[PDB]
Curated annotation (Swiss-Prot), chain A:
Present with 66000 molecules/cell in log phase SD medium. There are 2 genes for eS6 in yeast. Coiled coil: none annotated. Component of the small ribosomal subunit (SSU). Mature yeast ribosomes consist of a small (40S) and a large (60S) subunit. The 40S small subunit contains 1 molecule of ribosomal RNA (18S rRNA) and 33 different proteins (encoded by 57 genes). The large 60S subunit contains 3 rRNA molecules (25S, 5.8S and 5S rRNA) and 46 different proteins (encoded by 81 genes). Interacts with snoRNA U3. uS11 interacts with MPP10. Component of the ribosomal small subunit (SSU) processome composed of at least 40 protein subunits and snoRNA U3. There is a cross-link at K32 (Glycyl lysine isopeptide (Lys-Gly) (interchain with G-Cter in ubiquitin)). Component of the ribosome, a large ribonucleoprotein complex responsible for the synthesis of proteins in the cell. The small ribosomal subunit (SSU) binds messenger RNAs (mRNAs) and translates the encoded message by selecting cognate aminoacyl-transfer RNA (tRNA) molecules. The large subunit (LSU) contains the ribosomal catalytic site termed the peptidyl transferase center (PTC), which catalyzes the formation of peptide bonds, thereby polymerizing the amino acids delivered by tRNAs into a polypeptide chain. It is found in: Cytoplasm; Nucleus, Nucleolus. It comes from the Eukaryota. This is Small ribosomal subunit protein eS6A.
Swiss-Prot record, chain B:
GO terms for cellular component: 90S preribosome; cytoplasm; cytosol; cytosolic small ribosomal subunit. GO terms for biological process: cytoplasmic translation; translation. The keyword Mitochondrion does not apply. This is Small ribosomal subunit protein eS4A. It is found in: Cytoplasm. It comes from Saccharomyces cerevisiae (strain ATCC 204508 / S288c). There is a cross-link at K49, K121, K148, K155, K161, K166, K198, K220 (Glycyl lysine isopeptide (Lys-Gly) (interchain with G-Cter in ubiquitin)).
UniProtKB/Swiss-Prot annotation, chain D:
It comes from Saccharomyces cerevisiae (strain ATCC 204508 / S288c). This is Small ribosomal subunit protein uS17A. It comes from the Eukaryota. There are 2 genes for uS17 in yeast. Belongs to the universal ribosomal protein uS17 family. N-terminally acetylated by acetyltransferase NatA. The gene is RPS11A. GO terms for cellular component: 90S preribosome; cytosol; cytosolic small ribosomal subunit. Component of the small ribosomal subunit (SSU). Mature yeast ribosomes consist of a small (40S) and a large (60S) subunit. The 40S small subunit contains 1 molecule of ribosomal RNA (18S rRNA) and 33 different proteins (encoded by 57 genes). The large 60S subunit contains 3 rRNA molecules (25S, 5.8S and 5S rRNA) and 46 different proteins (encoded by 81 genes).
From Swiss-Prot, chain E:
This is U3 small nucleolar RNA-associated protein 20. Belongs to the UTP20 family. The chain holds residues 858 to 1563 of 2493 of the full protein. It comes from the Eukaryota. The gene is UTP20. HEAT repeats lie at residues 1-25, 319-355, 357-393, 483-521, 534-571, 605-640, 642-678. It comes from Saccharomyces cerevisiae (strain ATCC 204508 / S288c).
Length: 37, 228, 170, 127, 683
RNA sequence: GCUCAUUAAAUCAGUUAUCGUUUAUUUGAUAGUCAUGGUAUAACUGUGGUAAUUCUAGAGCUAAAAUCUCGACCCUUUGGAAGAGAUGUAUUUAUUAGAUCAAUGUCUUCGGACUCUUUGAUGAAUAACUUUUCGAAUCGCAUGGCCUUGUGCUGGCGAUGGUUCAUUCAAAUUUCUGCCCUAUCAACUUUCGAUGGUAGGAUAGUGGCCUACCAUGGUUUCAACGGGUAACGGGGAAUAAGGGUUCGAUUCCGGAGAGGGAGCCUGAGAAACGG
């Protein structure tokens, strides 16, 4: 419970730091490659 | 049970119907007839199931435990027998053909794009024939072009435009896969956009636009089509 | 029990009613869900498994726009005065699409004073709508189909939209 | 004039008249894109989309308002008779108020989310 | 009632119902429906709705005003974590606008009673209650958010009492500045909250200036409000507001727009003007931020102050006008229109009237003449013409600077297209000739421009133009007067654009022949080449102008001019290398007998003369077939680069123009006929 | 699943589009702005009735925020650093959009002015609401960063839960073609709209499908409409029959219904013989 509230608050920010950084990661791949065109 | 399965009439009354998946059902193929009926590799469906559960085979980089996964054009099949790697290919004589590929050409897969559309939050995407969706594509690709997929990510390594002069394999229609794969393109009444193909035996014959499969260049194409 | 099926009709030649099927679940021509004004009532209708249509049976307010500045507030309904495709629909006071219905757009006036600060002669708009802010009975159409939306939406009529419609009023 | 009914019409367009490119090698006449008729069922500056099947044929009837009848025909080869025999099947198509279409008048037609139970095609180019 | 708990709200509603009041007993259903969260929007639309059904009485709503406001503020004080709670907050903001004016003052004082502003009002500017509690910050943020909600609903109706609304907002603004002054690096959450408090307070203050305008007399507390502005913001205000038009910048811009608050900027000791000018003079400023400064100076110019230090504000604007000369070149269409209008307003005031100011204005007019007015509107071109006329109205005149200005004016007169703007430019040149000392050719060109403008005004001056053309034919205008002939070249090009029977075209050819004879008489390598280069610049563009035009009279006049110019001048080495030359049946026979059959190198002379006639024959049947044979002779008489340019012109016209594709291909095949013959000869 | 049923482009075979639609299931992408204060339903005994049902009533007890032309810039790009930057979809209507350059050029006064098929790169979002979402509900492993030394703010894989698109089997209409004797039936359709226009309702959706008000039209001697078919006959539907002349055999096949009309019901499936 308290241990489960540890893993809940850990994972809720873990996919936040994973996906939304990856959201900007291929966004900058678009930005570098649009400058190529 | 049609003839592109390349299965004998003996040993089976009800052919295994393919399940729902990333391909049209007519050129679909379950992995059970790929192993125990064309590779002659298993003997019963129960060990075909045991092949899938013990995860020594995989398709397109995913383990994909299903008896009736439909298999499309030149899918990458990964097996663990002397680290061998397999790819399908189409034959002129109305059948299927799988052959050994090494791992460098197994890393990519050259696939035709189906449609292109601007998506959510203003981003563009593109879809292929195998259901794989690639976003932020090349803006210079059009309908009936092709793309290489990474097999680790879904992005682009290589791409060529549809044109008149380069190797554009044929798939579907009254014909099914003649080697030589190019003359040119023109229009027609009713739609049904005319694509002509000239073989190595130098005969020209017309097809449709949905059968476009740009496989490479004269000399070197990107696919490892074997020797007959 | 209404039919939306295509084979009930006559052919281009006028073929004589070949009588192939009877009615199934798929061509279920639903009832005409005519509404009225009053306290808001909602019906949820399940079609095609997971599509939830919203039948608006009674409705009292709507989201009507004013295109000259592009704004829309919530306005209390008053009553329909004209419909193009029907006349007894007006006497029934049932609000379908494109029906010309009165409102008392007091918060439109309240927004106008909160954006300009000048009274309405008791940057500018044309004179034919100054005839009825004093009356407080502003005309508006219906934009969305209320029978499946479960919502009432429209816009205020604008310039020539009056000058063609009070011509059709009289 | 254009206003001839009990309701004003204007397409929502998903410049005051949004040009829409057909594809399939087509371009608007200048009368259509600077017209005044609204006509949301017309394939240009309207919600309907032109795509798919195309056909060309000769107008045979233009007697009434905003749809016309096209005679398309072929010297149809009956195999047992070894004879090309002309057969016409006059299909009715919609006509937009951008092309002053009379009988004769070779044109091109294509499918336009078919309108009323026999109108399956729509004019896109005159000649 | 002020608590955010719903059970406390229901307990207070039971306390309100227990109070002896018959109107509240009549409105007991209204209190229960407002307490019910499921009927929260329904109670506003029925019980709280005025000018409709189920409205309260006049005496009943006046007595129950504080109870209704405390319930509404308690609904507002609930946190909007949920979407329904956020929609309840928006409905609470919307329902407050239709109650009353004094009830809105009571609800604002109720929010002010929740906060604390007596200690800050008692002190001059110090935060005496030095408590940096986040709860004190959150209470100030809630009152700021409620005021922002109130300003959003009632943007021209939200009244503001000075002691109630303005004093607590200033106290919240001063607390945020005191929090930022005490902002250590440890309390990151408190520093971030005060930053949002400063951002919300500045937007609320900008909205308050936007809401009041000329309504609320804000001049009573304007001294303390600007004291809060000068301390927290004006430390590095010019060094900060440079990304876009800032909240303090828009507050200064609205203070610039309002004449009463313009005196409030004048109440400050020119600190706002010095900050605005230095932000305008920033090294890496943005165009959108600078554009607000230009509009603010235009409002200051259009509305001069009738008070103290107004000339000091005018002198600060004139010093900003000195910085505005290096500006207006690092910037859309509206920015060009605003920069032109600000320069026109500065010239209308005439504050920069010094000789060194006019020297910088001459440099500014040099950059203005450098900027071509093709993209700009004709009114902006007329405004630039009026601004230069204002500089011409100033007596600051030179010789070398006037000569560079006359060269730009002659380029402007040749490129002039508007009838009114060319009339103003000719009047500007008439003013320029009178203003610039030792400008007699400018005065002569002013007489030439006056006859040109009178010819545009009426057709009777066409005989006066012909007499002036006869006078210039009798001239006498040598290479020294080629600057006057440059205005004559612009006038001839203006006549070339028109169709006045080519009388000026033949007279300018006679004037060029007289000028070439004087240039041939003057054997100096500088002045004769300068007249030749002026002739080469004015004829070769006119040859290309005559190439595109269908005026055969212009082409025949150019043919007679080029016959005499090749015979007399013949100066260039490239012209000497190309000097291999000197109805339809006569044109075909002359083309076959020309030097194209006698030369293989003269590409430039053949292309500049015969290719326009070949294109004219391409548009006009037998002549086109004869031109194709003439093109083949010209292709054998051309160079490698010129043949590729003609082929690229032929190939691109074949793809684009569907007029004559086969004729262009036949011309390409005739061009390929000499190319294949030369390729086999090389092989 | 069972028995009775032939209407001759009718089913059916497909040449095709569904940017006009639906989709549980198949894949591929896909977000963010008090360790239950709280209701859990859950059963149980304990007497009864009724001829009688899986008939039944009543009683008690279960520091939730990162991003920026980025910047005043400094002192280096390992950079950091003032702060007008503001940053959830779902429905459901509106308002605003969704070119020129470095030129392999002619030409130049040998700088570089005349800069798309003259190197080459190609333009043509939101203000409101609704009977939103509360914006990882779970889980197996690990037993970490370091003092906030507390049963701590912690993550490496979290397999798997959701949101919206494309694909997929599922059909819905529909494009054309593929059939039999016939003109000793020449006109038929409005004699259930017959043909279009627009609007509205309904539909998952185009739709005369239906309704409203208009205009009167549409298909034909190239045969519209009409008489014949155990259409147990057709369909390459299907291997073959290693010679039973052309098939011995394989299957699709024409529908309605669960005593009979009438209406309703849930499911991505259906007017169910599982109400």
């Amino acid at each position: 419970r308290l241990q489960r509230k540890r893993h809940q608050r850990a994972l809720k920010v873990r996919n936040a730091q994973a996906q939304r950084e990856a959201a900007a990661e291929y966004a900058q791949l678009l930005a570098k490659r649009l400058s190529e065109r | 049970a049609p003839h592109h399965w390349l299965l004998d009439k003996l040993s089976g009354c009800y052919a295994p119907r393919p399940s729902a998946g990333p391909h049209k059902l007519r050129e679909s193929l379950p992995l059970i007839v790929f192993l125990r009926n064309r590779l002659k590799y298993a003997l019963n469906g129960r060990e075909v199931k045991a092949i899938l559960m013990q995860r020594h085979v995989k398709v397109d980089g995913k383990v994909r435990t299903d008896t009736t996964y439909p298999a499309g054009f030149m899918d990458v099949i990964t097996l663990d027998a002397t680290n061998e790697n397999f790819r399908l290919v189409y034959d002129v004589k109305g059948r299927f053909a799988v052959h050994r590929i090494t791992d460098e050409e197994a890393s990519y897969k050259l696939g035709k794009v189906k449609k292109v559309q601007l998506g959510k939050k203003g981003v563009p995407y593109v879809v292929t024939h195998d259901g794989r969706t690639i976003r932020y594509p090349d803006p210079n690709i059009k309908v009936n072009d092709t793309v290489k997929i990474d097999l680790a990510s879904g992005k682009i390594t290589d791409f060529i435009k549809f044109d008149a002069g380069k190797l554009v394999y044929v798939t579907g229609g009254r014909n099914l896969g003649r080697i030589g794969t190019i003359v040119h393109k023109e229009r027609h009444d009713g739609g049904f956009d005319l694509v002509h193909i000239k073989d190595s035996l130098d005969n020209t014959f017309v097809t449709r636009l949905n059968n476009v499969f740009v496989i490479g260049e004269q000399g070197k194409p990107y696919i490892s089509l074997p020797k007959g | 029990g209404i039919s939306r099926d295509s084979r009930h009709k006559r052919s281009a030649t006028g073929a004589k009613r070949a009588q192939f099927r009877k009615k199934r679940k798929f061509e279920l021509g639903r009832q005409p869900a005519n509404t009225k004004i009053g306290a808001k009532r909602i019906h949820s209708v399940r079609t095609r498994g997971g599509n939830k249509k919203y039948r608006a049976l009674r409705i009292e307010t709507g989201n009507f726009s004013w295109a000259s500045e592009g704004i829309s507030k919530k306005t209390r309904i008053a009553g329909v005065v004209y419909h193009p495709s029907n006349n007894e629909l007006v006497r029934t006071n049932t609000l379908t699409k494109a029906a010309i219905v009165q409102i008392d757009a007091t918060p439109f006036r309240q927004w106008f004073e909160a954006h300009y600060g000048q009274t309405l002669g008791k940057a500018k708009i044309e004179s034919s709508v100054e005839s009825q802010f004093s009356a407080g009975r502003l005309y508006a159409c219906i934009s969305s189909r209320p029978g499946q939306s479960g919502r009432c939406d429209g816009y205020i009529l604008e310039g020539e939209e009056l000058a063609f419609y009070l011509r059709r009023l009289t | 004039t254009v206003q001839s009914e009990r309701a004003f019409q204007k397409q929502p367009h998903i410049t005051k008249r949004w040009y829409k490119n057909a594809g399939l090698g087509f371009k608007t006449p200048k009368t259509a894109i600077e017209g005044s008729y609204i006509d949301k069922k017309c394939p240009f500056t309207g919600l309907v989309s032109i795509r798919g099947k195309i056909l060309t044929g000769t107008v045979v009837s233009t007697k009434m308002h905003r749809t016309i009848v096209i005679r398309r025909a072929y010297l149809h080869y009956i195999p047992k008779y070894n004879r090309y025999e002309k057969r016409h099947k006059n299909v009715p198509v919609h006509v937009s108020p951008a092309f002053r279409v009379q009988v004769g008048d070779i044109v091109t037609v294509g499918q336009c989310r078919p309108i009323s139970k026999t109108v399956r095609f729509n004019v896109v180019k005159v000649s | 009632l002020g608590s955010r708990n719903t059970d406390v709200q229901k307990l207070a509603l039971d306390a309100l119902l227990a109070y002896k009041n018959p109107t509240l007993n009549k409105y007991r259903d209204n209190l229960k429906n407002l307490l019910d969260d499921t009927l929260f929007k329904d109670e506003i639309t029925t019980f709280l709705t005025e000018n409709g059904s189920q409205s309260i009485k006049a005496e009943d709503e006046k007595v129950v005003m504080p109870y209704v406001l405390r319930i509404f503020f308690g609904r507002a004080q609930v946190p909007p974590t949920s979407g329904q709670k956020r929609s309840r907050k928006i409905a609470v903001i919307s329902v407050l606008p239709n109650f009353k004016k004094p009830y809105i003052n009571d609800f604002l004082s109720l929010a002010s009673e929740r906060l604390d502003y007596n200690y800050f009002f008692g002190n001059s500017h110090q935060i005496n209650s030095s408590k940096a509690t986040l709860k004190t910050i959150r209470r100030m943020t809630g009152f700021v958010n409620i005021v922002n909600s109130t300003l959003s609903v009632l943007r021209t109706n939200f009244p503001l009492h000075t002691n109630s609304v303005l004093q607590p907002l200033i106290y919240s603004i001063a607390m945020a500045y005191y929090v930022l002054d005490t902002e250590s690096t440890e309390e990151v959450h408190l520093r971030k909250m005060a930053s949002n408090l400063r951002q919300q307070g500045l937007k609320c203050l900008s909205s308050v200036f936007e809401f009041v305008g000329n309504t609320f007399d804000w001049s009573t507390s304007m001294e303390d409000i600007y004291a809060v502005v000068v301390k927290p913001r004006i430390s590095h205000f010019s060094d900060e507001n440079l990304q876009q038009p800032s909240s303090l910048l828009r507050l200064f811009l609205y203070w610039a727009h309002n004449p009463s608050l313009y005196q409030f900027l004048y109440y400050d000791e020119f600190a706002t003007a010095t900050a605005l000018m230095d932000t305008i003079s920033n090294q890496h400023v943005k165009e959108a931020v600078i554009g607000p400064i230009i509009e603010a100076a235009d409002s200051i110019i259009r509305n001069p102050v009738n008070d103290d230090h107004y000339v000091d504000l005018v002198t600060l604007i004139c010093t900003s006008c000195l910085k505005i000369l290096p500006s207006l070149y690092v910037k859309d269409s509206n920015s060009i229109s605003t920069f032109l209008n600000l320069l026109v307003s500065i010239t209308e005031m005439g504050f920069i009237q010094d000789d060194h100011v006019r020297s910088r204005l001459i440099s500014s007019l040099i950059s203005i003449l450098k900027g071509k007015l093709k993209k700009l509107q004709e009114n902006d071109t007329q405004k630039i013409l009026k601004i230069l006329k204002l500089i011409v109205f100033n007596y600051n005149c030179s010789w070398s600077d006037i000569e560079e200005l006359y060269t730009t004016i002659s380029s402007l007169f040749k490129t002039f297209d508007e009838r009114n703007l060319r009339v103003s430019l000719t009047e500007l040149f008439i003013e320029l000739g009178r203003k610039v000392p030792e400008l007699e050719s400018i005065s002569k060109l002013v007489a030439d421009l006056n006859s040109y403008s009178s010819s545009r005004m009426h057709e009777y001056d066409f005989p006066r133009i012909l007499s002036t053309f006869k006078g210039l034919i009798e001239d006498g205008y040598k290479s020294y007067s080629e600057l006057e002939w440059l205005p004559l070249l612009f006038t001839f090009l203006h006549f070339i654009n028109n169709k006045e029977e080519l009388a000026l075209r033949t007279n300018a050819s006679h004037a060029i022949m007289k000028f070439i004879d004087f240039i041939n008489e003057k054997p100096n390598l500088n002045e004769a080449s300068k007249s030749i280069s002026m002739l080469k610049d004015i004829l070769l563009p006119n040859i290309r102008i005559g190439l595109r035009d269908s005026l055969e009279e212009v082409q025949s006049e150019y043919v007679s001019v080029l016959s005499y110019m090749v015979k007399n001048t013949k100066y260039f080495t490239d012209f000497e290398d190309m000097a291999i030359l000197l109805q339809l049946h006569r044109r075909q026979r002359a083309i076959k007998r020309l030097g194209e059959h006698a030369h293989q190198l003269k590409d430039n002379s053949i292309s500049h003369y015969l290719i326009p006639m070949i294109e004219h024959y391409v548009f006009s049947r037998n002549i086109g077939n004869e031109t194709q044979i003439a093109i083949g002779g010209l292709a054998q008489h051309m160079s490698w680069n010129q043949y590729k340019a003609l082929l690229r012109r032929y190939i691109s016209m074949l793809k684009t123009k569907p007029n004559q594709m086969k004729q262009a291909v036949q011309l390409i095949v005739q061009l390929s006929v000499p190319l294949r013959e030369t390729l086999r000869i090389v092989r």
